[PDB]
C-alpha positions as a printed NumPy array, in Angstrom:
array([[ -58.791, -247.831,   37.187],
       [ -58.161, -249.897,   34.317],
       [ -59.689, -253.547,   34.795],
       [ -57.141, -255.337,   32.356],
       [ -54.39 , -253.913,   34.46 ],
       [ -55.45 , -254.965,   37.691],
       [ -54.604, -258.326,   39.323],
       [ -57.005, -260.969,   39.632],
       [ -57.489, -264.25 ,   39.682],
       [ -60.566, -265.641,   37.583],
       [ -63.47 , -266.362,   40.126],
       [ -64.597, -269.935,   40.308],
       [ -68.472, -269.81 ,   39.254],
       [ -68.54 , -273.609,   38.234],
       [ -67.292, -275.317,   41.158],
       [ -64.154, -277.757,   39.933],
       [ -61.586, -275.496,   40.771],
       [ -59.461, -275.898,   37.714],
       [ -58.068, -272.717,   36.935],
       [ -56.61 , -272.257,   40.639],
       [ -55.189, -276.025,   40.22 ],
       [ -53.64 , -274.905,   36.858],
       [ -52.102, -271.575,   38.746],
       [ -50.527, -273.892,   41.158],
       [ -49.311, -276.516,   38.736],
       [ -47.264, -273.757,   37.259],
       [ -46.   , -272.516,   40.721],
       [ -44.782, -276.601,   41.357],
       [ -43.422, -276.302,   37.554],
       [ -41.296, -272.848,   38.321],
       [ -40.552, -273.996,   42.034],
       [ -38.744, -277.113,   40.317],
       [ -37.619, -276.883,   36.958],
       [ -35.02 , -274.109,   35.8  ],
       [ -36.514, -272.779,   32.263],
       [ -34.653, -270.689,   29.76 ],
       [ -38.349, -269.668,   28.324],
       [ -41.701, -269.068,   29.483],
       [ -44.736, -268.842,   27.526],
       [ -48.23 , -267.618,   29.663],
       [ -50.989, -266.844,   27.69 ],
       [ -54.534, -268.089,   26.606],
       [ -55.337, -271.287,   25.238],
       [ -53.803, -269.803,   21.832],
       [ -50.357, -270.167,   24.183],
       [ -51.844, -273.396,   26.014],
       [ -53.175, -275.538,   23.009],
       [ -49.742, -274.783,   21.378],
       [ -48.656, -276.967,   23.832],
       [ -51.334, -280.33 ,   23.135],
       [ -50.021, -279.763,   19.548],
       [ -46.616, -281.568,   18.32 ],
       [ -44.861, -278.885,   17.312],
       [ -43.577, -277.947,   20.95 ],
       [ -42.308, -281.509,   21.59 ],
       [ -40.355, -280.112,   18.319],
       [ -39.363, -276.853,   18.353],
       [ -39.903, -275.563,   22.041],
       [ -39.085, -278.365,   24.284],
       [ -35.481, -278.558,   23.063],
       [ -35.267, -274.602,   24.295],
       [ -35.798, -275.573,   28.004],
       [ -39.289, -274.009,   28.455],
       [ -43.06 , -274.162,   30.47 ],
       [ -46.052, -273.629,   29.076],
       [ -48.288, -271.762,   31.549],
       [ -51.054, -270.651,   29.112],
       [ -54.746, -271.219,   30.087],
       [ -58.017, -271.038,   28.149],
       [ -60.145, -268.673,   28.747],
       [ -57.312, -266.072,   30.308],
       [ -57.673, -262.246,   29.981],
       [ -55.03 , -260.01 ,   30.6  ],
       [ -55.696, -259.28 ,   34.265],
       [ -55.786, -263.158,   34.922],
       [ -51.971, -263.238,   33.55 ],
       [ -50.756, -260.19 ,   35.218],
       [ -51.87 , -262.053,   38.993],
       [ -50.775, -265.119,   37.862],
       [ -47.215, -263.67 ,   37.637],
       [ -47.399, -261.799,   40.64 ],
       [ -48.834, -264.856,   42.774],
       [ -46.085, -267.758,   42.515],
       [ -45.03 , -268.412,   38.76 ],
       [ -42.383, -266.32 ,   38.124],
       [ -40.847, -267.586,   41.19 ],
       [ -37.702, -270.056,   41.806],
       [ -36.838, -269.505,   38.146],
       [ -34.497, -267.135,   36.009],
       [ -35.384, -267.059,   32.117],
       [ -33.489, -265.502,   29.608],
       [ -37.171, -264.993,   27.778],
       [ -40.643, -264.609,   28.603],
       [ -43.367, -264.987,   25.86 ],
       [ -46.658, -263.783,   26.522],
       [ -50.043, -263.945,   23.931],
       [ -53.411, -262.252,   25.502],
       [ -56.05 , -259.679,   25.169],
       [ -58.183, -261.557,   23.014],
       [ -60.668, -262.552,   25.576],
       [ -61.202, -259.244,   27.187],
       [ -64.581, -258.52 ,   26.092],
       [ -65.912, -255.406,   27.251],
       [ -62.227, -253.887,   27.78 ],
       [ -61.315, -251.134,   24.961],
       [ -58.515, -251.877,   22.727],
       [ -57.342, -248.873,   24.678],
       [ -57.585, -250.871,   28.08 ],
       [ -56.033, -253.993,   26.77 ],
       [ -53.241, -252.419,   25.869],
       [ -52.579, -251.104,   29.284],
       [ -53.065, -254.608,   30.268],
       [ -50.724, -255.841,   28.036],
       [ -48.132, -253.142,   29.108],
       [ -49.181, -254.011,   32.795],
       [ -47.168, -257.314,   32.302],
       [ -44.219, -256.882,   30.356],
       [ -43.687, -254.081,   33.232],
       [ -44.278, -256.242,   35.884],
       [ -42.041, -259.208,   34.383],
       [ -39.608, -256.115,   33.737],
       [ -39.729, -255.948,   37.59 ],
       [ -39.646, -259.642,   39.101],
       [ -37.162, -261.108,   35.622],
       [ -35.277, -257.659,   34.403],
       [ -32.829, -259.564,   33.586],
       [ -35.323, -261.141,   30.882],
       [ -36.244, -260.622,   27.16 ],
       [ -40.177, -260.336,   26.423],
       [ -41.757, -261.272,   23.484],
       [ -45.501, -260.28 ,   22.726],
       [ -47.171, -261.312,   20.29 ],
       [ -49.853, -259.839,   18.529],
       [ -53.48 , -260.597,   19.16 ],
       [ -55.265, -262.845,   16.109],
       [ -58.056, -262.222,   13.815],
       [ -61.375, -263.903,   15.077],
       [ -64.744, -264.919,   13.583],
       [ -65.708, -266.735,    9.856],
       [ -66.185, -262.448,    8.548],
       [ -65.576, -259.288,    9.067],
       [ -66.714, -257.958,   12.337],
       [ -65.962, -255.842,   15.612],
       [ -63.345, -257.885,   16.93 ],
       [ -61.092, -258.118,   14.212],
       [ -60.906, -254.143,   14.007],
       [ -60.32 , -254.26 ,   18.214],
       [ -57.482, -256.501,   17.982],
       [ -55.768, -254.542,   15.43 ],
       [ -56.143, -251.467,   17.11 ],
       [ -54.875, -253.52 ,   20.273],
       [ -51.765, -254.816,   17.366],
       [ -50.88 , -251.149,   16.547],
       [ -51.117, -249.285,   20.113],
       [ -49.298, -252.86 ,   21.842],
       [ -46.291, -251.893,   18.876],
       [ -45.865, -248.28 ,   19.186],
       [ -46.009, -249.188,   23.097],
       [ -42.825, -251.616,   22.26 ],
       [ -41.187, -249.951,   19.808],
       [ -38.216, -248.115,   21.937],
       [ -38.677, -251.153,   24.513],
       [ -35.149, -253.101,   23.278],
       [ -35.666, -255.633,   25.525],
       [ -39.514, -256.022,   24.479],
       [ -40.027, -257.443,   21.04 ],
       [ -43.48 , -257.462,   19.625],
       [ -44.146, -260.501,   17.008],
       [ -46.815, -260.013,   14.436],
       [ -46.766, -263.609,   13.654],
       [ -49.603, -263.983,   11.566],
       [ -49.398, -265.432,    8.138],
       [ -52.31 , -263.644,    6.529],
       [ -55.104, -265.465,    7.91 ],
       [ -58.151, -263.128,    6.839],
       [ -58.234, -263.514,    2.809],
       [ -58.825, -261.471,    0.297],
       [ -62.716, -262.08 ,    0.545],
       [ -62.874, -261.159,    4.216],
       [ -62.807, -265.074,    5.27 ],
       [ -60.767, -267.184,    7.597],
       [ -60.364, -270.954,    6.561],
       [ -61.991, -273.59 ,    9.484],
       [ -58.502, -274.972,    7.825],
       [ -57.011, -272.637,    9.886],
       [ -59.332, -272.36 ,   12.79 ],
       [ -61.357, -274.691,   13.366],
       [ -64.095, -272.176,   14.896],
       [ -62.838, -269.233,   13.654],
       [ -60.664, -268.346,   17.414],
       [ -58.946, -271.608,   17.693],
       [ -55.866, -272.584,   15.05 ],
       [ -55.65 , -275.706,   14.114],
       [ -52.765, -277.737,   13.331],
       [ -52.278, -276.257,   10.391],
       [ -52.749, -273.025,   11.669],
       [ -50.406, -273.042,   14.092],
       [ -47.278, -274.251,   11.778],
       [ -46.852, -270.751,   10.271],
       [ -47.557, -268.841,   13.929],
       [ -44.868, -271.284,   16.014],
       [ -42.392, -271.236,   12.923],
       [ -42.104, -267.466,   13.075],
       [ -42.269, -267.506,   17.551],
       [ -39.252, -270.279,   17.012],
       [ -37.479, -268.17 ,   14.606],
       [ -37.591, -264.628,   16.833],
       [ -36.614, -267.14 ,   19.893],
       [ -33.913, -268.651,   18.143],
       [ -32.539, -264.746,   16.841],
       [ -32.312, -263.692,   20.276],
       [ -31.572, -266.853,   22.464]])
C-alpha cells in the first residue's frame, strides 16, 4: 500500500548504527522520565533541540525531544510503535515530518502523516496532537515547495473536525515576495537557523501554552 504509512525502521547502509542507537535512546528517555510533551520529528524537530530556545521555552513544559535527521514519515510511525511511546503518559504529542519523503506524493504523505496521529490516537488517546505544517525548501521556486503545500492543505482539511488534533501553520512568511528564502533564515535553504527558528518555536510555544 502506501509506503509513508507503513512501519519501518531506516535501514543501516553506512555501518555506525546511529539511527537504531537514537531509537533506543528515546525508548531509555520514555522508559524513565514522565513527560507532559513529546516532540518526534526530523531534524527540523531535532535541531530545535541543539538550539537555546528549548532550554527556554520547552524544557520548563516537561518534554523529550525524539526528532532525528533525515526521518520520513514511515520512520516516525515505527518509531512509535517500537518502544517510545512506552512507560509515559503526555498530555501532548508534537509531531513535524513529510519533508524528506522524496518520491512519496503529497497524496501519500499525507496518509503518512494521518498514519501517526491515528496511531498515537491509539497507544496516548488520552493525548492532544499537534502537527505542524511542512516548510518551504530550496533558495527559488521549485517542485517541492508546491508538494509541501499541497501536503499543508490535504494534512488541514484531514485535521480540521479532529478536536483533539491541531494543525500549526507556523511559518512566518519565509518565501518573499521575489520567490526567495533568506540563508538568514536557512542556512541551506531546508535547515532554519537561529533566527529562523525564533518565529516557528514562538508560535509551537504559544499553541502549547493555549492548550496545556
Amino acid at each position: 500500500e502506501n509506503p509513508a504509512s507503513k512501519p519501518t525502521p531506516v535501514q543501516d547502509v553506512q555501518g555506525d548504527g546511529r539511527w537504531m542507537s537514537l531509537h533506543h535512546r528515546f525508548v531509555a528517555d520514555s522508559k524513565d522520565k514522565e513527560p507532559e510533551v513529546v516532540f518526534i520529528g526530523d531534524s527540523l524537530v531535532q535541531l530545535m533541540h541543539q538550539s537555546e530556545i528549548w532550554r527556554e521555552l520547552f524544557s520548563p513544559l516537561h518534554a523529550l525531544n525524539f526528532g532525528i535527521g533525515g526521518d520520513s514519515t514511515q520512520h516516525v510511525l515505527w518509531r512509535l510503535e517500537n518502544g517510545e511511546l512506552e512507560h509515559i503518559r503526555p498530555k501532548i504529542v508534537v509531531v513535524w515530518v513529510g519533508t524528506n519523503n522524496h518520491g512519496h506524493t503529497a497524496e501519500q504523505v499525507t496518509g503518512g502523516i494521518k498514519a501517526i496521529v491515528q496511531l498515537v490516537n491509539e497507544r496516548q488517546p488520552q493525548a492532544r496532537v499537534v502537527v505542524l505544517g511542512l516548510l518551504p525548501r530550496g533558495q527559488h521556486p521549485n517542485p517541492l515547495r508546491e508538494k509541501n503545500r499541497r501536503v499543508n492543505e490535504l494534512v488541514r482539511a484531514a485535521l480540521a473536525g479532529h478536536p483533539r488534533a491541531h494543525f500549526l501553520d507556523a511559518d512566518p512568511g519565509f518565501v518573499h515576495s521575489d520567490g526567495t528564502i533568506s540563508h538568514h533564515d536557512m542556512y541551506d535553504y531546508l535547515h532554519l537557523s537561529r533566527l529562523g527558528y525564533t518565529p516557528v518555536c514562538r508560535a509551537l510555544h504559544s499553541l502549547l501554552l493555549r492548550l496545556l
